[PDB]
Design a protein around this motif. Structure first.
Motif, PDB file in Angstrom:
ATOM      1  N   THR A 292       0.772  -1.211   0.000  1.00 31.69           N
ATOM      2  CA  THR A 292       0.000   0.000   0.000  1.00 31.69           C
ATOM      3  C   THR A 292       0.814   1.277   0.000  1.00 31.69           C
ATOM      4  O   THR A 292       1.974   1.319   0.436  1.00 31.69           O
ATOM      5  N   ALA A 293       0.209   2.320  -0.557  1.00 38.07           N
ATOM      6  CA  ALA A 293       0.850   3.640  -0.701  1.00 38.07           C
ATOM      7  C   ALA A 293      -0.187   4.713  -0.426  1.00 38.07           C
ATOM      8  O   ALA A 293      -1.397   4.478  -0.723  1.00 38.07           O
ATOM      9  N   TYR A 294       0.309   5.803   0.182  1.00 33.34           N
ATOM     10  CA  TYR A 294      -0.496   6.869   0.816  1.00 33.34           C
ATOM     11  C   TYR A 294       0.032   8.167   0.308  1.00 33.34           C
ATOM     12  O   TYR A 294       1.250   8.338   0.111  1.00 33.34           O
ATOM     13  N   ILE A 295      -0.862   9.131   0.105  1.00 32.02           N
ATOM     14  CA  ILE A 295      -0.478  10.530  -0.080  1.00 32.02           C
ATOM     15  C   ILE A 295      -1.077  11.348   1.093  1.00 32.02           C
ATOM     16  O   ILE A 295      -2.305  11.294   1.313  1.00 32.02           O
ATOM     17  N   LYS A 296      -0.236  12.043   1.838  1.00 36.05           N
ATOM     18  CA  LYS A 296      -0.657  12.725   3.079  1.00 36.05           C
ATOM     19  C   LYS A 296      -1.540  11.825   3.920  1.00 36.05           C
ATOM     20  O   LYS A 296      -2.673  12.196   4.313  1.00 36.05           O
ATOM     21  N   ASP A 297      -1.097  10.584   4.100  1.00 37.42           N
ATOM     22  CA  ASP A 297      -1.795   9.621   4.972  1.00 37.42           C
ATOM     23  C   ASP A 297      -3.133   9.083   4.510  1.00 37.42           C
ATOM     24  O   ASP A 297      -3.753   8.285   5.204  1.00 37.42           O
ATOM     25  N   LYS A 298      -3.546   9.459   3.316  1.00 33.18           N
ATOM     26  CA  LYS A 298      -4.715   8.867   2.671  1.00 33.18           C
ATOM     27  C   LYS A 298      -4.324   7.734   1.742  1.00 33.18           C
ATOM     28  O   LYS A 298      -3.497   7.949   0.827  1.00 33.18           O
TER      29      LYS A 298
END
Ligand SMILES: [Ca+2]
Ligand SMILES: [Cl-]
Length: 159
Positions: free
Chosen positions: A144-150
């Motif tokens: 999994t990968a997140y941008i600003k924790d989303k």
């Protein structure tokens, strides 16, 4: 209408690495691509690799190469309190404020890393492991990968 940060999208591709006869090293390579229409800052991106540590209380992350400098890649390894299929541990990979940005259609290229334990790992019972992606990079949706924790890519190891 949404605004830039809601249409930002990334994807990760993955290559399983080699295993030898000590078997206490997880090797994998990732590549992070900007598949959306606005620039992303690498400092806002986190990646998680989910696994079972098989008794290892010490699991050390090391990044061995990045085009923008290994010193700009950070990793921490955390225990998961509750029980989830294929993971009692995750490795969270992040980037420093000066790692740079990814333009639309841009990618990091290969980022190889190791997680090193004192004792042997069995990787078949690790959620993020996919041995079919050994010869070529593939779409491993169990990283999994997140941008600003989303969450922006993949399916989280789920209680
Ligand atoms: Ca394991
Ligand atoms: Cl920083």
């Amino acid at each position: 209408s949404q605004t830039p940060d809601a249409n930002a999208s990334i994807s990760v591709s993955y290559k399983c690495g080699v295993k030898d006869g000590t078997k206490n090293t997880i090797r994998a390579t990732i590549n992070i691509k900007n598949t959306g229409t606005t620039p992303v800052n690498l400092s806002d991106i986190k990646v998680r690799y989910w696994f079972t540590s098989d008794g290892n209380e010490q699991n050390n992350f090391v990044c061995d190469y990045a085009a923008f400098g290994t010193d700009k890649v950070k990793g921490i390894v955390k225990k998961i309190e509750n029980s989830v299929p294929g993971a009692d541990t995750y490795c969270e990979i992040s980037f420093t404020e000066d790692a740079g940005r990814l333009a639309p259609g841009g990618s990091t290229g290969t980022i190889p890393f190791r997680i090193e334990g004192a004792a042997e790992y069995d990787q078949t019972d690790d959620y993020s492991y996919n041995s079919e992606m050994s010869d070529d990079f593939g779409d491993n949706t169990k990283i999994t990968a997140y941008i600003k924790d989303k969450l922006k890519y993949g399916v989280e190891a789920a209680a």
